[PDB]
Ligand code: HEM
């Protein structure tokens with residue numbers, strides 16, 4: 001289920017983080033407006049860029065903690081408010097997060113593995129809900 005999937009992802013987190021973020025960027029190329037350093041690079045080139053690996057892993061480090069602190073796939077209000085208020089998220093709207101989670105769920109579905117894709121789909125919807133309640137446009 002969802003708790004075990006957090007463990008699974010944490011057990012190889014930089015790999016999963018990069019692969020899921022690449023799935024996102026490749027599915028939604030316009031999303032690179034927010035990541036201008038990542039333009040004009042293949043996946044292998046991005047995995048060679050120090051900030052790509054560093055930053056993407058730190059995104060998923062926090063994402064896994066938000067998932068772990070959730071109840072029934074519903075994040076804490078404090079976690080949602082942190083994600084809204086972060087200066088690095090100034091530009092963002094809930095649609096950006098929706099898209100991240102669509103890509104993450106598709107990645108899990110296409111993996112060979114027994115991820116609880118349903119629970120991640122709910123988590124994404126519930127996080128988007130919580131971001132809106134905490135004041136994200
Ligand atoms: C639950 C989902 C997310 C979490 C937990 C999260 C967390 C983080 C964290 C921890 C950082 C700092 C990274 C660092 O400085 O090393 C960061 C930066 C950033 N995040 Fe988020 N983030 C999430 C979703 C998103 C989404 C959906 C977008 C846009 C589509 C986004 C855009 C940014 C940008 C532009 C930065 C700074 C630029 C960069 O780090 O390259 N984040 N985020």
Ligand SMILES: Oc1cccc(-c2cccc(O)c2)c1
Nearest residue numbers: 020021024052055056059100
């Ligand atoms: O390196 C970064 C820094 C900020 C955010 C992300 C990100 C954004 C959308 C999907 C996703 O999986 C990861 C990646």
